[PDB]
Amino acid sequence: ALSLTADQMVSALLDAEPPILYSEYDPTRPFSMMGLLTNLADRELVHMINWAKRVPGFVDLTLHDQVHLLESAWLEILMIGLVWRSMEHPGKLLFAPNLLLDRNQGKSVEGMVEIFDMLLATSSRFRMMNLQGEEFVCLKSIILLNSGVYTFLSSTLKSLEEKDHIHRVLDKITDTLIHLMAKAGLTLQQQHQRLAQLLLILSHIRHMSNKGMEHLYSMKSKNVVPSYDLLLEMLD
Amino acid sequence: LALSLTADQMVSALLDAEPPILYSEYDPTRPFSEASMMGLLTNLADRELVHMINWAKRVPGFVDLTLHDQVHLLESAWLEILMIGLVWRSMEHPGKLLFAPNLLLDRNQGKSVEGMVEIFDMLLATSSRFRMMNLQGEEFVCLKSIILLNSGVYTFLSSTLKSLEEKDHIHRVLDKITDTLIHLMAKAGLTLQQQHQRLAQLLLILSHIRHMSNKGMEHLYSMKKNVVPSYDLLLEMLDAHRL
Numbered sequence A: 001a002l003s004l005t006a007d008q009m010v011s012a013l014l015d016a017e018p019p020i021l022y023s024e025y026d027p028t029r030p031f032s033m034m035g036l037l038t039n040l041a042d043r044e045l046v047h048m049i050n051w052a053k054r055v056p057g058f059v060d061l062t063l064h065d066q067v068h069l070l071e072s073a074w075l076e077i078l079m080i081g082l083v084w085r086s087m088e089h090p091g092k093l094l095f096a097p098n099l100l101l102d103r104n105q106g107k108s109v110e111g112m113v114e115i116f117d118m119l120l121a122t123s124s125r126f127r128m129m130n131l132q133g134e135e136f137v138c139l140k141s142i143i144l145l146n147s148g149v150y151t152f153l154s155s156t157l158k159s160l161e162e163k164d165h166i167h168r169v170l171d172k173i174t175d176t177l178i179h180l181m182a183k184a185g186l187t188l189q190q191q192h193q194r195l196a197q198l199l200l201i202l203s204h205i206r207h208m209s210n211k212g213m214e215h216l217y218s219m220k221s222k223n224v225v226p227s228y229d230l231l232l233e234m235l236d
Numbered sequence B: 001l002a003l004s005l006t007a008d009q010m011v012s013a014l015l016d017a018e019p020p021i022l023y024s025e026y027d028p029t030r031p032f033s034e035a036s037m038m039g040l041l042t043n044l045a046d047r048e049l050v051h052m053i054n055w056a057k058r059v060p061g062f063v064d065l066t067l068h069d070q071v072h073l074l075e076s077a078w079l080e081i082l083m084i085g086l087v088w089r090s091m092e093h094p095g096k097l098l099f100a101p102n103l104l105l106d107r108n109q110g111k112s113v114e115g116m117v118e119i120f121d122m123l124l125a126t127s128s129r130f131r132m133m134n135l136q137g138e139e140f141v142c143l144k145s146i147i148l149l150n151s152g153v154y155t156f157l158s159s160t161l162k163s164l165e166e167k168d169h170i171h172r173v174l175d176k177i178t179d180t181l182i183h184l185m186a187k188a189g190l191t192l193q194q195q196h197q198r199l200a201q202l203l204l205i206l207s208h209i210r211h212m213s214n215k216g217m218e219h220l221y222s223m224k225k226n227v228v229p230s231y232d233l234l235l236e237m238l239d240a241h242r243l
């Protein structure tokens, strides 16, 4: 599937997009913050596995490596999705269409408003850059392929082939991002510049995931961080 | 006035601003298993940080920022910058980390402190990736300046007119480093496709470097020691003389 043209790559990613889910609270009852966020994330994760298997090249990998990639990336992917759908809602986070929250509403869990603030800034940055949908799906696929690629625990022949593949798929997505920017009329300089600005935002998204992963682990709750086996059970 | 700088001028500036490679301070005539490995890394890092401040002030456009914003950027970036330095000078030493010329450690030596072999393994993998990519010195200095300028830019948390202007400037300087990276690549004869593919490959490694810094910072905080540089320390070091 690295024979795909740039336009075929975009279409495939656009097709693979997960749906927008709703929060599960009774809207007729008075308005747990973590509870709502957790159920939302749970349900999104199932759809994320579905999406991942539709990212060109992903199912070419071993099941083990697919799990490793998702294990490393799942919160980054949830967060970029959140930031994307929040883009046109300054100062708020659209967790769900029935759950649009501001930073003050985040101040009811310790350490949450700090995370909310980081997400809001990323959304602002997306707005400034006028991030497009076709660019977003590319960046999201890059996260899936990239975040875990430096932490493969082996140098077996197969693992070398797997890493080679991952980097070839990533190069294809780079080629596609550039194409999108060419299609929109950006100059060559502008193209490289925007590529860089987009990819640099991924470091901040990594950062936000790390801070959030710290929170989930501090809870000392058994099922809160997805196990290898859960991911394995879903992917197979 | 560093936005007028050319691509070759930008590289030259950055190469000239490079900090020195420091040596570990242990008595080499003394038994090795005495020394605390966290002790050695901490002292090395302390000394490196001073040189980092002076390097930062020589990154084109960095001293055009407010002192508060300079501090914020370094507060965010300092461990990423130490780590990319480490990974760079380890590039030519497979399976080892060259903390200093007289302190070249493997992953087994990192098993000294619990939780540290995991970080060593990530650093080693980064170094291996640099090796695979045949990372050049001029590309290295560009990436390191990008880390300095980019890592804290999303967390200023001021929307004053001044802060807007500061962020605009940071992104203009970043754009210029991007132009510089591309120029280097075109100079080396890479096709346009190869140029944008390698730019992306290099920038994606920065996310893993962020990751490594976060895991490292988790450790330093876990110690419950003054081991994380305070704002006031960074301010004290940056807010200097000219006497």
Ligand SMILES: CCN(CC)CCOc1ccc(/C(=C(/Cl)c2ccccc2)c2ccccc2)cc1
Pocket: A037, A038, A039, A040, A041, A042, A043, A045, A078, A079, A082, A095, A112, A115, A211, A212, A213, A215, A216, A223, A224, A225, A226, A227
């Ligand atoms: C295995 C079961 N797990 C993961 C699915 C339960 C899910 O735990 C959570 C997963 C994600 C989030 C979350 C955010 Cl922003 C968050 C993370 C950490 C600390 C504070 C906030 C978020 C929720 C929805 C969309 C985007 C982000 C919260 C709990």
Ligand SMILES: CCN(CC)CCOc1ccc(/C(=C(/Cl)c2ccccc2)c2ccccc2)cc1
Pocket: B038, B041, B042, B044, B045, B046, B049, B082, B083, B086, B099, B116, B119, B215, B216, B217, B219, B220, B226, B227, B228, B229
């Ligand atoms: C007192 C304030 N700071 C000074 C920065 C002290 C900060 O202590 C340390 C700073 C850096 C390192 C360090 C590594 Cl790789 C590390 C970090 C966390 C856990 C395990 C290892 C490193 C050292 C030198 C070069 C590259 C990396 C260790 C202690």
